[PDB]
Enzyme design. Structure first.
Site, short mmCIF file in Angstrom:
data_model
loop_
_atom_site.label_atom_id
_atom_site.label_comp_id
_atom_site.label_asym_id
_atom_site.label_seq_id
_atom_site.Cartn_x
_atom_site.Cartn_y
_atom_site.Cartn_z
N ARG A 91 0.82 -1.21 0.00
CA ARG A 91 0.00 0.00 0.00
C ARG A 91 0.85 1.25 0.00
O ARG A 91 2.03 1.19 0.31
CB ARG A 91 -0.93 0.02 1.18
CG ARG A 91 -0.27 0.16 2.49
CD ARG A 91 -1.30 -0.09 3.60
NE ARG A 91 -0.76 0.19 4.93
CZ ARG A 91 -1.30 -0.28 6.07
NH1 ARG A 91 -2.40 -0.99 6.05
NH2 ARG A 91 -0.79 0.02 7.26
N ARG A 125 0.26 5.75 -5.89
CA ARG A 125 -0.13 4.37 -6.16
C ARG A 125 0.71 3.75 -7.28
O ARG A 125 0.91 2.54 -7.34
CB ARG A 125 -1.65 4.27 -6.50
CG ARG A 125 -2.61 4.66 -5.39
CD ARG A 125 -4.02 4.87 -5.95
NE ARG A 125 -4.99 5.34 -4.95
CZ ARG A 125 -5.28 6.63 -4.77
NH1 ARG A 125 -4.55 7.58 -5.35
NH2 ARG A 125 -6.26 6.97 -3.95
N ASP A 133 -14.18 6.49 -5.57
CA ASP A 133 -14.00 7.92 -5.86
C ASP A 133 -15.37 8.59 -6.04
O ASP A 133 -15.58 9.75 -5.63
CB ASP A 133 -13.15 8.12 -7.11
CG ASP A 133 -11.79 7.46 -6.99
OD1 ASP A 133 -11.83 6.20 -7.02
OD2 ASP A 133 -10.74 8.14 -6.87
N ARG A 166 -17.09 9.07 -2.74
CA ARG A 166 -16.51 10.26 -2.09
C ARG A 166 -17.03 11.58 -2.66
O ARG A 166 -17.38 12.51 -1.92
CB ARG A 166 -14.97 10.22 -2.18
CG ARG A 166 -14.34 9.17 -1.28
CD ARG A 166 -12.83 9.06 -1.57
NE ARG A 166 -12.15 8.26 -0.55
CZ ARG A 166 -11.09 7.47 -0.74
NH1 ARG A 166 -10.57 7.31 -1.97
NH2 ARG A 166 -10.60 6.76 0.28
N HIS A 187 -8.35 5.43 -10.82
CA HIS A 187 -8.46 5.56 -9.36
C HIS A 187 -7.12 6.13 -8.85
O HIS A 187 -6.18 5.37 -8.45
CB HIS A 187 -8.78 4.22 -8.73
CG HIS A 187 -8.74 4.26 -7.23
ND1 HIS A 187 -9.68 4.91 -6.46
CD2 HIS A 187 -7.85 3.72 -6.34
CE1 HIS A 187 -9.34 4.84 -5.19
NE2 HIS A 187 -8.25 4.11 -5.08
N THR A 243 -6.29 3.41 4.45
CA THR A 243 -7.77 3.54 4.37
C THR A 243 -8.32 2.12 4.35
O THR A 243 -7.65 1.16 3.85
CB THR A 243 -8.25 4.34 3.17
OG1 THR A 243 -8.44 3.51 2.03
CG2 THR A 243 -7.35 5.51 2.81
N1 NAI Z 1 -8.64 0.18 -4.85
C1 NAI Z 1 -8.82 0.97 -3.81
O1 NAI Z 1 -9.67 1.87 -3.73
C2 NAI Z 1 -7.96 0.76 -2.58
C3 NAI Z 1 -6.86 -0.06 -2.64
N2 NAI Z 1 -6.07 -0.28 -1.58
C4 NAI Z 1 -4.98 -1.19 -1.78
O2 NAI Z 1 -5.27 -2.45 -1.11
C5 NAI Z 1 -4.05 -3.15 -0.93
C6 NAI Z 1 -4.00 -3.68 0.48
O3 NAI Z 1 -3.90 -2.60 1.45
P1 NAI Z 1 -3.97 -2.96 2.98
O4 NAI Z 1 -4.97 -4.05 3.22
O5 NAI Z 1 -4.14 -1.68 3.75
O6 NAI Z 1 -2.44 -3.54 3.26
P2 NAI Z 1 -2.04 -4.47 4.47
O7 NAI Z 1 -0.53 -4.29 4.50
O8 NAI Z 1 -2.86 -4.20 5.68
O9 NAI Z 1 -2.37 -5.91 3.95
C7 NAI Z 1 -1.90 -6.57 2.79
C8 NAI Z 1 -1.96 -8.05 2.99
O10 NAI Z 1 -1.58 -8.61 1.74
C9 NAI Z 1 -0.84 -9.78 2.08
N3 NAI Z 1 -0.05 -10.32 0.99
C10 NAI Z 1 1.17 -9.83 0.54
N4 NAI Z 1 1.62 -10.67 -0.43
C11 NAI Z 1 0.72 -11.67 -0.59
C12 NAI Z 1 0.59 -12.88 -1.39
N5 NAI Z 1 1.57 -13.17 -2.28
N6 NAI Z 1 -0.51 -13.64 -1.27
C13 NAI Z 1 -1.49 -13.41 -0.37
N7 NAI Z 1 -1.47 -12.32 0.44
C14 NAI Z 1 -0.37 -11.47 0.38
C15 NAI Z 1 0.01 -9.35 3.24
O11 NAI Z 1 0.60 -10.45 3.98
C16 NAI Z 1 -0.99 -8.54 4.08
O12 NAI Z 1 -1.71 -9.31 5.03
C17 NAI Z 1 -2.93 -2.16 -1.22
O13 NAI Z 1 -2.44 -2.38 -2.53
C18 NAI Z 1 -3.65 -0.83 -1.15
O14 NAI Z 1 -2.99 0.25 -1.82
C19 NAI Z 1 -6.28 0.34 -0.39
C20 NAI Z 1 -7.38 1.17 -0.22
C21 NAI Z 1 -8.29 1.47 -1.29
#
Ligand code: NAI
Ligand code: NAI
Ligand code: NAI
Ligand code: NAI
Ligand code: 9Y7
Ligand code: 9Y7
Ligand code: 9Y7
Lengths: 331, 323, 331, 328
Positions: free
Chosen positions: A98, A105, A165, A168, A192, A247
């Protein structure tokens, strides 16, 4: 006879597949918000969770299982092995790096593409007929990547895109007008991210065009500076990340909203990441958000939104920025 | 005229919220309570309070960004308790998760009078641990009547019990009945006489139920109620989702005046030969005035003794507290 | 001594006021469809029913009470006496008399005035601060009648108006486009039923105006005959009445949606009938549907829709006709 | 060139959670609205023999689609509209006729089932059948015999409603929500049902153990009247409004929830009970059953008194005696 035997007469012991199974890959802040939101909307009869951190995964699974009395999802499973994901209708991918404060991003690409190279073939192996809902960032680029790696038809590969978005934008419009967001209509399309496009020409309450009422809406000459609403949408993640570190809640609700339409075959319209080739003269295989009809086969149709020349130029700039990245990826 | 005034004719210009809930402490537990209450449409206004101002604002904004997907039209926050005015239900999740107990008592000394100032006729729902002790502390500091001070107590413990019972029997937890009473956590008491499916007493069917000699070791189900929590803390660092759902279930009964029965922590002096001012979980009828009634469960000698040992333990700690 | 007292220790016997009470007056098909829909949306902590037919009333109450296990509304009461309605937040009026063959509209309205002179003062006695939601037909006139008799401020007297007509329009639009009605926007305003006005300029999907894409939309030049969508909004109601004898389910759902906005203070916009003197060159105390913002104080605000000359003339013609009837009524 | 094609670019040219209700009287339509407001189906089909009423009911529900999350509602007299249902709920019944005998009415309902059930089976050979129509225990047997389905897939509403009423009445006596008042009414729906006093409890506290006269003629508090009121209150509703509908519809939606969501909750529904309680004949009676996606997968063996067992046995004898007299 055991207690169970004395209490309960079995008519048949047959294993049936789940009817409405959802998997979430990545049990971090986003994956767990998507999970709780999906559980409290009664969308699945089986929820499977996958991560690479085994202790965290088991703990999260147990914590949800302890809440079972209060839910209507009778089987919650987890594992690092993708066999736990078999026969999913919908697989939601939230895994990966993240944004840190002030990072874009687009700085997450290498990390998250290399995660997807492992995840996506494993998902497809165990649920060859699922819909894939991509949340990991940068979500438009990763939707393209998931489509290329999976071999799925593009109707079944859906990025969460600008559903958030747009939510929001509607919240902020509601705050200005004193109306619930449900009754404030307005679309944010494209990436996004920083290059998203507010569609001022479609903003309305009760079918009354706000741009018709206020011709300067969204321009630099606007005395009410409505462009600041879109600037606030763009800056949203950065502020919330600055304040709480990440977030989670809004994206969890947004993903559950998308999941509702897919799982219940609603044919609602949402702005989600998909292939835009053929619209607005764009020739490239670029993925970004446009309004799409969502239901049991994923994206069945695209709405052809009429854009002003400035709106269309801004959407094409968003497409150019994304395609610049998407075109250099190695598979 | 502004665009708003061009679009909208105003008929009417002060509103008091009608179904307001406050959550104090926006850690993992407070935010799990918040999302669960939001997704159950229990409140018309949700207020959040903490001492960490940036975290608080960020949590508030993240929820507000999901407003389109909810039916709770006002979400507010602040360090100042004016934001909490006119709450029907105030849920306290603030904490650390004898010196440590005193540090949560020290937090309560500030929180409780501020809550009472702005919502003097609310129900208080205490989640912070040690929950039975802090429910007592909140009762003493608030000066509220016993009906309006409720500890989350064994509602979560009982939900865990019913999950684990259901897993053994292959029946949904809703149809697996059983009560865990007394202190939340280690010293809780499983009431084996009440464990049943469809009104069939498992203890009558299997008289060794719960005992050391039980070939099927059903006492392990209660051991796992205790130990599964510590396991979740070891594995993920804390617990959040199940408590959040438990709390939202309590909130539903209170807000909707349901008069459902829940095992929550209440001032129990005068029952079970308990002679001190302590809060333990027993089945309580919950509604709009909090705890209006409680069920007098028939307990064995051993069960009564365990509640009495717990009350002595709680009381021992409480008499040392400074507030 | 009693089993109850052996089982349950009472802490306090304090008399409670309900906090979120709704009353439905009139337990015909429409009142009961309102009741069940409100019950299954968990909007009230107490539901009161009133009618003049005592047996039917008691039987409906009991049947609902028998379903209590499945609901989250802990008290359901009824009676011919209005004391059962005390302290209601919202009072829904579905009672009245149906037009007879060869009966003039003026005669029919006067009979319903007479029935409202019985009902409304008794509602006001027991719930002086309620919002009144009038469903009984002719709904725009009877909303005026309820407003005059009650003495309530304009914001607290609401007619169900075109909320149902608009929901029918959005259904029929959705059927033509293959889109869920949630994502098909469009507004039918003015008089409920026969004389309602389809606002073609506001008909859109994803903010894209159908009339902009298809300028002949709604006219006699239209090869796709979109005017038939509005013809069917009017006629499909007559058709249901011919086929089953009455309508009930849709109106019940639509009333529950209104009640949701009021009871939860949502500030969602709905086309409901409100006193419109001072808009569109209307000079008389008449009630017609325009998009209104609904919340805990009823109608707090309304949207000023831009209407074509023809649309405005239709609203004015309706106002003239309604005032012509109203001025002859005997209160 | 069409407006639709100017607006929408098409990418792609069966329902997954479909429910059918057969018989759109007050009961069928109450089941329908309750199922719609619980978001249990993606497609709802309605069937009747009265074509105008059927079409009108369908249209009236469709007009409420904006407020629902069930995107397809269909109807017809032809069972092709019911194809690929997961759950088919039968609420069809004959109208009582002045002077007809009880056995005549039963046979007329049997004749209706002879037409319906083969048509349901043809178009959804793999569905669960939920029988609501009375006499419900007899007609569940009949549907089982005609369909040729395995017993897990033929479910009668049975005492599900009776038990709901019992818990309501118990809640009214105790001042507790019915959700927290537990007690089971088993056996035949209606007058011959059996209140299982030993299982009546709040918070796992046996009311019978507290109050040993509970349910007997000695009882100063006349708790037997709670059970008598279960069937009497039903007949009172019928006297007052002409029929019952809302409580049955809500209770049927609760059954449908357990089945559609594979919950494995326990409900007292009518199931083929031969081999339990010394019952030797092919009859359906209500016992607590575990309900989920395969229908009745398991049932609970409630411990009964000798007197309770003898009541169920007498009911079985009665039912089998009638079933021999029926033509189908
Ligand atoms: N599309 C959107 O609107 C949004 C997207 N995001 C994105 O969501 C993603 C996750 O963010 P968070 O949950 O806050 O991060 P986080 O760090 O809390 O969790 C990510 C999880 O992914 C796991 N992970 C990493 N490599 C992996 C693999 N090879 N296989 C299975 N699991 C694996 C990690 O071990 C961790 O538990 C980020 O890329 C973030 O930027 C976040 C908010 C909004
Ligand atoms: N009763 C039960 O069954 C359960 C209780 N708990 C308890 O819930 C509590 C919170 O746990 P977590 O959320 O994991 O802890 P956490 O550390 O994540 O959050 C606690 C929050 O309280 C806030 N806080 C501290 N002092 C404050 C003050 N004076 N005013 C307002 N807020 C203040 C902190 O800044 C923090 O944001 C703990 O005491 C924990 O043991 C947790 C699980 C189950
Ligand atoms: N606004 C809209 O969009 C719609 C309005 N309606 C209207 O709803 C109204 C009710 O329709 P139904 O339920 O089909 O009619 P109905 O005739 O079945 O029910 C009317 C009920 O009102 C009761 N009633 C009569 N005088 C009364 C009094 N003084 N006090 C209390 N109750 C009294 C009757 O006894 C009866 O039970 C009609 O005026 C109908 O046109 C119906 C559908 C849509
Ligand atoms: N099991 C339970 O606890 C309860 C069962 N019921 C039963 O529900 C049933 C329906 O009750 P109501 O709706 O009041 O009766 P109703 O007589 O109004 O409706 C029955 C419907 O069945 C239809 N029907 C008749 N023959 C048909 C056929 N061959 N195919 C399709 N449809 C056909 C009729 O045309 C009618 O629309 C009755 O048998 C009633 O006793 C009612 C309440 C409780
Ligand atoms: N009967 S009593 O009020 O004296 C009492 C209650 C609880 C405990 C132990 C205890 C504590 C705890 C935390 C901070 C303290 F300062 C403290 F003294 C204790 N947290 N906790 C948790 N439970 C969970 C869960 O999900 O169940 C997550 S944390 C738990 O079981 C001891 C005594
Ligand atoms: N603007 S106004 O107040 O003057 C007005 C309102 C309504 C109507 C036509 C009308 C009437 C009606 C009933 C009794 C009368 F005496 C009468 F004049 C008309 N019922 N009704 C119904 N609508 C449905 C449905 O489901 O939509 C079921 S009934 C409908 O569309 C005309 C004028
Ligand atoms: N064990 S059995 O199958 O032989 C059996 C079942 C039912 C009855 C009596 C009976 C009947 C009935 C209807 C038509 C008949 F041809 C018939 F024989 C009986 N309807 N009914 C109803 N119950 C309600 C309610 O709301 O509870 C509304 S109607 C009820 O209690 C007797 C025996």
């Amino acid at each position: 006879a055991t207690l169970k035997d004395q209490l309960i007469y079995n008519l048949l012991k047959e294993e049936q597949t789940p009817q409405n199974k959802i998997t979430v890959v990545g049990v971090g802040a986003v994956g767990m918000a998507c999970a709780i939101s999906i559980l409290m909307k009664d969308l699945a009869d089986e929820l499977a969770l996958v991560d690479v951190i085994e202790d965290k995964l088991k703990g999260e699974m147990m914590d949800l299982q302890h809440g079972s009395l209060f839910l209507r999802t009778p089987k919650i499973v987890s594992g690092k092995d993708y066999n736990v994901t078999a026969n999913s209708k919908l697989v939601i991918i939230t895994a990966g790096a993240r944004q840190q404060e002030g990072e874009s991003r687009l700085n997450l690409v290498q990390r998250n593409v290399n995660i997807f190279k492992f995840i996506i073939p494993n998902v497809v192996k165990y649920s060859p007929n699922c819909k894939l809902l991509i949340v990991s960032n940068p979500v438009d680029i990763l939707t393209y990547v998931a489509w290329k790696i999976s071999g799925f038809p593009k109707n079944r590969v859906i990025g969460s895109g600008c559903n958030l978005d747009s939510a929001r934008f509607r919240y902020l419009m509601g705050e200005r007008l004193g109306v619930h967001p449900l009754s404030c209509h307005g679309w944010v399309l494209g990436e996004h991210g920083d290059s998203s496009v507010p569609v001022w020409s479609g903003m309305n309450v009760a079918g009354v065009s706000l741009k018709t009422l206020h011709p300067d809406l969204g321009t630099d000459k606007d005395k009410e500076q409505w462009k600041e609403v879109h600037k606030q949408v763009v800056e949203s993640a950065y502020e919330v990340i600055k304040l709480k570190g990440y977030t989670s809640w809004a994206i969890g609700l947004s993903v559950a909203d998308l999941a509702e339409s897919i799982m219940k075959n609603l044919r609602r319209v949402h702005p989600v990441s998909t292939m835009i080739k053929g619209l607005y003269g764009i020739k490239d295989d670029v993925f970004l958000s446009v309004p799409c009809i969502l239901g049991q086969n994923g994206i069945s149709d695209l709405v052809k939104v009429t854009l002003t020349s400035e709106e269309e130029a801004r959407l094409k700039k968003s497409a150019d920025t994304l395609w610049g990245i998407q075109k250099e990826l190695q598979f």
